[PDB]
Amino acid sequence: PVLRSVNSREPSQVIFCNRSPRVVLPVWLNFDGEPQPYPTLPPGTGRRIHSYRGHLWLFRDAGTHDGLLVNQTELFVPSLNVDGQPIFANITLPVYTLKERCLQVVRSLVKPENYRRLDIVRSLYEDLEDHPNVQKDLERLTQERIAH
Amino acid sequence: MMYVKLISSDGHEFIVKREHALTSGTIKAMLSTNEVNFREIPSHVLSKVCMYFTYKVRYTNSSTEIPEFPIAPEIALELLMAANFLDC
Amino acid sequence: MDVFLMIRRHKTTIFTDAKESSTVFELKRIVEGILKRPPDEQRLYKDDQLLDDGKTLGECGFTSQTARPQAPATVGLAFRADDTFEALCIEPFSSPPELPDVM
Ligand SMILES: COCCOCCOc1cc([C@H](C(=O)N2C[C@H](O)C[C@H]2C(=O)N[C@@H](C)c2ccc(-c3scnc3C)cc2)C(C)C)on1
């Protein structure tokens, strides 16, 4: 309802640059605020995209849903093309906290059913199970906009 | 002072820039003192924590392509516990 | 160009950065500012190779490609113990426990 694309109907050509070692999942927030997944981008690859002014995009790891940055921020909004020159959407790894990075590595090695078999504190078991999720992040970003 | 000393459970002394150690909220509190002893963090974990501080300070607020922070599977569990205690 | 290092001696490890164009002698001045030992009482190594004071860190093999923030390059250090230099000794870090069955 709040975080949604504006139906401008004004085309905007964008280049999605995956400057990360992850397979990227571009996510478009439709006119109702629903995340719509788009075809994945392999690690060093770029893609020319036809989008519109005022549309909202976010990018995640396709396999784990780990958060990624686009032009050093969470959301990408295609702007006006000056001279038909496309807008760059530089998709990079954020500087994850060492804790989050450790959670990522552990999640990648152990099956979710065996998280409870790990010899760690109960709060860390819950942290492993609280895997990254687009809907949760959208709720978080919506809450942070109200504070402003 | 300019540098601080972080001592592992097995006695290894790691001398890092004060600004880099302040990345950890736990260390920041323990200092505010120029040395900190970690009776639960071994050297193979604490060395990686110091490498993380360098990585974080170098790549935060930077447009240069950020590389992946590598974590060997063998160190992942202990490093997770250490990161959780250190709040970093 | 910055180069990221671990200057190691016995159970001591200094995490610092330096320019690729900076010299081995200039690195000894950095060690002096930390461990309070003058350059004449220091020997710096790359593996078993003794490094010459006038050589740049780049010339000694410490480049941006090999001395990364997340994987710093190791520089060995030995002090002069009463006019005779000690042998280069670097205590290894602890061994990680055996990988759990779940991994
Ligand atoms: C010119 O005025 C039009 C008036 O019509 C009224 C305004 O139209 C429109 C049209 C649209 C949407 C739309 O089209 N969008 C949404 C994003 O903005 C993107 C765009 C879109 O789907 N582009 C296509 C071409 C496309 C883009 C990227 C890829 C990817 S992503 C990774 N690898 C690939 C290959 C694939 C396909 C549709 C509802 C889907 O919203 N409003």
XYZ file of C-alpha atoms and ligand atoms in Angstrom:
381
model
C 0.000 0.000 0.000
C 2.752 2.526 0.817
C 5.831 1.008 -0.912
C 4.501 0.664 -4.463
C 5.290 1.661 -8.053
C 3.704 4.785 -9.480
C 1.865 4.053 -12.780
C 3.602 6.901 -14.678
C 3.427 5.170 -18.090
C 6.740 7.042 -18.886
C 9.362 4.570 -20.082
C 12.817 4.535 -18.509
C 15.585 2.287 -19.800
C 17.821 0.859 -17.087
C 20.967 -1.287 -16.983
C 20.977 -3.768 -14.118
C 24.731 -4.383 -13.298
C 25.384 -7.346 -11.033
C 28.654 -6.210 -9.382
C 28.297 -9.018 -6.830
C 29.264 -12.730 -6.670
C 25.601 -13.729 -6.093
C 22.907 -14.731 -8.567
C 20.639 -11.646 -8.404
C 16.823 -11.695 -8.229
C 15.394 -8.364 -9.362
C 12.107 -7.606 -7.614
C 9.599 -5.078 -8.914
C 7.056 -3.683 -6.418
C 3.841 -3.681 -8.434
C 1.062 -1.023 -8.281
C -0.472 -2.808 -5.238
C 2.892 -3.051 -3.368
C 3.309 -6.777 -4.146
C 6.830 -8.014 -4.917
C 7.075 -9.422 -8.451
C 10.168 -11.503 -9.209
C 12.002 -10.997 -12.505
C 14.523 -13.279 -14.369
C 17.776 -13.829 -12.463
C 21.161 -12.254 -13.274
C 24.335 -14.363 -13.013
C 27.224 -12.899 -10.910
C 29.281 -10.653 -13.293
C 26.479 -9.997 -15.763
C 24.488 -6.929 -16.871
C 21.024 -6.663 -18.486
C 19.303 -3.841 -20.398
C 15.805 -3.464 -18.859
C 12.701 -1.621 -20.031
C 11.028 -0.088 -16.963
C 9.163 3.181 -16.117
C 9.730 6.399 -14.150
C 8.642 6.092 -10.510
C 8.736 2.280 -10.478
C 10.283 0.593 -7.415
C 12.922 -2.138 -7.479
C 14.854 -4.077 -4.885
C 17.476 -6.821 -5.377
C 18.183 -10.000 -3.449
C 20.301 -13.184 -3.682
C 18.129 -15.539 -5.821
C 18.923 -18.620 -3.741
C 19.010 -17.330 -0.160
C 17.114 -13.992 -0.385
C 20.068 -12.144 1.270
C 19.691 -8.387 0.900
C 21.695 -6.516 -1.723
C 22.302 -2.818 -2.385
C 21.470 -0.956 -5.575
C 23.376 2.321 -6.029
C 24.381 2.042 -2.321
C 20.722 1.998 -1.124
C 17.841 -0.509 -0.671
C 15.447 0.737 -3.350
C 15.974 1.698 -6.999
C 13.619 4.091 -8.732
C 14.171 4.577 -12.475
C 14.447 8.259 -13.301
C 14.201 10.399 -16.512
C 16.588 9.287 -19.299
C 18.672 12.314 -20.342
C 19.650 11.934 -24.067
C 18.052 8.451 -24.088
C 21.093 7.401 -21.963
C 20.023 4.565 -19.622
C 20.026 4.767 -15.802
C 22.603 2.547 -14.086
C 21.458 0.180 -11.340
C 24.691 -1.008 -9.719
C 23.871 -4.095 -7.654
C 26.476 -4.762 -4.976
C 26.901 -6.810 -1.809
C 26.320 -4.667 1.294
C 28.929 -4.772 4.071
C 27.027 -7.437 6.014
C 27.524 -7.611 9.786
C 30.000 -10.428 10.671
C 27.021 -12.045 12.517
C 24.764 -11.939 9.426
C 27.610 -13.169 7.219
C 28.201 -16.090 9.651
C 24.461 -16.867 9.653
C 24.598 -16.953 5.804
C 27.522 -19.396 5.756
C 25.953 -21.665 8.401
C 22.544 -21.630 6.553
C 24.425 -22.631 3.344
C 26.092 -25.632 5.053
C 23.366 -27.079 7.324
C 19.835 -28.205 6.274
C 17.049 -26.276 8.077
C 15.882 -29.460 9.849
C 19.342 -29.873 11.491
C 19.633 -26.258 12.813
C 18.451 -27.506 16.248
C 21.244 -30.123 16.312
C 23.940 -27.351 16.306
C 25.719 -26.755 19.634
C 24.831 -23.030 19.953
C 22.704 -20.761 22.212
C 18.865 -20.859 21.640
C 18.847 -17.204 20.406
C 21.281 -18.175 17.590
C 19.028 -21.089 16.520
C 16.188 -18.536 16.120
C 18.548 -16.163 14.231
C 19.371 -18.994 11.738
C 15.661 -19.784 11.266
C 14.781 -16.082 10.779
C 16.109 -16.281 7.227
C 16.004 -13.188 4.978
C 12.588 -12.516 3.447
C 11.365 -9.780 1.012
C 7.951 -9.380 2.708
C 9.615 -8.846 6.120
C 11.985 -6.220 4.616
C 9.078 -4.444 2.908
C 7.284 -4.277 6.298
C 10.492 -2.920 7.872
C 11.029 -0.268 5.120
C 7.348 0.759 5.412
C 7.706 1.191 9.221
C 10.878 3.287 8.790
C 9.075 5.714 6.410
C 6.376 6.508 9.071
C 9.097 7.598 11.576
C 10.086 10.364 9.072
C 45.645 5.270 22.315
C 45.992 4.911 18.430
C 46.146 1.064 18.676
C 44.522 -1.435 21.074
C 45.407 -5.022 22.022
C 42.905 -7.877 21.764
C 44.083 -11.079 23.430
C 42.644 -14.452 22.478
C 41.808 -17.351 24.862
C 45.076 -19.055 23.780
C 47.276 -15.983 24.409
C 47.689 -14.502 20.891
C 47.906 -10.723 21.034
C 46.290 -8.850 18.143
C 47.169 -5.173 17.829
C 44.534 -3.323 15.809
C 43.711 0.387 15.220
C 41.412 1.728 17.983
C 38.878 2.925 15.354
C 38.740 -0.584 13.827
C 38.131 -2.283 17.208
C 35.326 0.233 17.983
C 33.315 -1.556 15.174
C 32.423 -4.046 17.953
C 29.961 -2.508 20.409
C 31.166 -4.952 23.112
C 34.855 -3.935 22.652
C 33.799 -0.237 22.566
C 32.236 -0.700 26.022
C 35.187 -2.762 27.365
C 37.612 0.009 26.395
C 35.613 2.995 27.695
C 42.022 0.646 29.081
C 44.108 -0.310 26.000
C 43.929 -4.156 26.271
C 40.988 -6.563 26.222
C 41.123 -10.282 27.123
C 38.721 -12.747 25.461
C 38.701 -15.960 27.502
C 36.222 -17.588 25.059
C 37.577 -16.495 21.642
C 40.497 -18.563 20.273
C 43.163 -17.125 17.891
C 41.741 -18.757 14.745
C 38.503 -16.852 15.440
C 39.933 -13.567 16.806
C 42.299 -13.197 13.816
C 39.238 -13.462 11.494
C 37.351 -10.922 13.653
C 40.252 -8.457 13.182
C 40.225 -9.115 9.419
C 36.477 -8.327 9.498
C 37.194 -4.971 11.230
C 39.656 -4.063 8.447
C 37.138 -5.209 5.774
C 34.284 -3.232 7.375
C 36.281 0.003 7.749
C 37.670 -0.272 4.193
C 34.406 -1.037 2.397
C 31.730 0.895 4.418
C 30.816 4.190 2.647
C 32.590 3.143 -0.570
C 31.367 2.905 -4.183
C 34.237 0.536 -5.195
C 32.896 -3.044 -5.808
C 32.672 -4.831 -2.440
C 34.064 -8.382 -2.345
C 32.579 -11.253 -0.333
C 33.911 -11.626 3.239
C 35.239 -15.205 3.248
C 34.462 -17.602 6.077
C 35.900 -21.128 6.098
C 33.268 -23.735 7.063
C 35.519 -24.987 9.934
C 35.471 -21.535 11.630
C 31.818 -20.559 10.842
C 30.209 -21.777 14.123
C 32.762 -20.235 16.506
C 32.945 -17.045 14.427
C 29.121 -16.777 14.610
C 29.219 -17.060 18.418
C 32.055 -14.519 18.622
C 30.240 -12.086 16.269
C 27.085 -12.440 18.356
C 28.996 -11.634 21.602
C 30.909 -8.775 19.977
C 27.803 -7.186 18.338
C 29.468 -6.737 14.950
C 47.737 1.887 -3.427
C 46.975 0.435 0.037
C 48.247 -2.959 1.104
C 46.736 -4.779 4.147
C 49.126 -6.603 6.465
C 49.569 -8.848 9.522
C 53.030 -8.182 11.032
C 53.734 -11.302 13.112
C 56.262 -12.329 15.798
C 55.831 -15.225 18.279
C 52.271 -14.625 19.671
C 52.026 -10.995 18.438
C 50.117 -9.905 15.311
C 49.789 -6.280 14.202
C 46.976 -5.464 11.773
C 47.973 -2.406 9.746
C 47.918 -0.996 6.211
C 50.684 0.694 4.213
C 51.297 2.082 0.691
C 52.595 -0.305 -1.986
C 55.294 2.375 -2.697
C 56.286 2.579 1.015
C 59.567 0.869 2.021
C 60.481 -2.014 4.364
C 62.350 0.599 6.464
C 59.233 2.785 6.657
C 57.290 -0.313 7.803
C 59.941 -0.834 10.563
C 59.191 2.774 11.723
C 55.478 1.775 11.987
C 56.470 -1.275 14.078
C 58.662 1.058 16.199
C 55.671 3.315 16.912
C 53.694 0.276 18.119
C 56.121 -2.174 19.782
C 58.737 0.501 20.815
C 61.761 -1.209 19.181
C 63.997 0.708 16.764
C 64.465 -0.379 13.122
C 68.081 -1.499 13.821
C 66.675 -4.082 16.286
C 64.135 -5.427 13.687
C 64.181 -7.893 10.763
C 61.177 -8.182 8.415
C 60.428 -11.285 6.368
C 58.160 -12.471 3.578
C 57.944 -16.213 4.356
C 61.649 -17.206 5.027
C 63.059 -14.369 2.856
C 64.699 -11.452 4.689
C 63.468 -8.111 3.316
C 65.901 -5.302 2.382
C 65.176 -1.901 4.009
C 65.297 0.067 0.748
C 62.844 -2.185 -1.111
C 59.197 -1.121 -1.529
C 56.390 -3.324 -0.191
C 55.310 -3.837 -3.839
C 58.851 -5.017 -4.690
C 58.629 -7.425 -1.729
C 55.465 -9.013 -3.195
C 52.896 -7.122 -1.102
C 50.438 -5.831 -3.689
C 46.735 -4.793 -3.584
C 45.930 -8.165 -5.263
C 47.678 -10.194 -2.471
C 47.290 -8.063 0.647
C 43.502 -7.608 0.935
C 41.568 -6.203 3.926
C 39.736 -9.537 4.391
C 42.870 -11.635 3.675
C 45.927 -9.599 4.731
C 49.457 -10.616 3.777
C 51.809 -11.843 6.528
C 55.094 -10.043 7.282
C 57.405 -11.927 9.674
C 59.220 -10.006 12.425
C 62.320 -10.883 14.505
C 63.994 -8.722 17.150
C 67.682 -8.318 18.103
C 68.180 -9.993 21.479
C 71.448 -8.426 22.851
C 73.446 -7.805 19.599
C 72.386 -11.183 18.060
C 69.098 -11.559 16.116
C 66.653 -14.246 17.202
C 65.352 -16.816 14.696
C 62.084 -15.947 12.894
C 59.391 -17.688 14.891
C 55.668 -17.232 14.336
C 53.315 -19.173 16.616
C 50.492 -20.677 14.554
C 46.879 -19.847 15.357
C 44.713 -22.441 17.166
C 43.223 -25.335 15.203
C 39.498 -25.284 14.448
C 37.557 -28.249 15.869
C 36.424 -31.092 13.602
C 33.638 -30.115 11.166
C 30.277 -31.317 12.594
C 28.388 -34.088 10.767
C 25.703 -31.479 9.817
C 28.389 -29.700 7.655
C 4.699 3.518 -22.842
O 3.587 3.706 -21.986
C 3.000 2.481 -21.613
C 1.620 2.731 -21.099
O 1.076 1.532 -20.549
C 0.773 1.634 -19.158
C 2.038 1.563 -18.357
O 2.664 0.297 -18.685
C 3.161 -0.450 -17.681
C 3.704 -1.726 -17.871
C 4.063 -2.136 -16.651
C 4.764 -3.322 -16.174
C 6.092 -3.483 -16.894
O 6.140 -3.527 -18.113
N 7.205 -3.490 -16.141
C 7.308 -3.418 -14.684
C 8.696 -2.836 -14.484
O 8.677 -1.418 -14.626
C 9.503 -3.462 -15.613
C 8.515 -3.558 -16.787
C 8.690 -4.876 -17.533
O 8.074 -5.892 -17.209
N 9.526 -4.826 -18.570
C 9.873 -5.997 -19.373
C 10.184 -5.539 -20.795
C 11.044 -6.717 -18.735
C 11.953 -6.026 -17.944
C 13.001 -6.681 -17.327
C 13.197 -8.046 -17.521
C 14.342 -8.739 -16.894
S 14.731 -8.380 -15.257
C 16.062 -9.460 -15.370
N 16.238 -10.030 -16.519
C 15.266 -9.617 -17.409
C 15.312 -10.165 -18.798
C 12.275 -8.745 -18.298
C 11.216 -8.085 -18.896
C 3.876 -4.573 -16.334
C 2.711 -4.396 -15.385
C 4.646 -5.841 -15.994
O 3.836 -1.156 -15.754
N 3.219 -0.072 -16.427
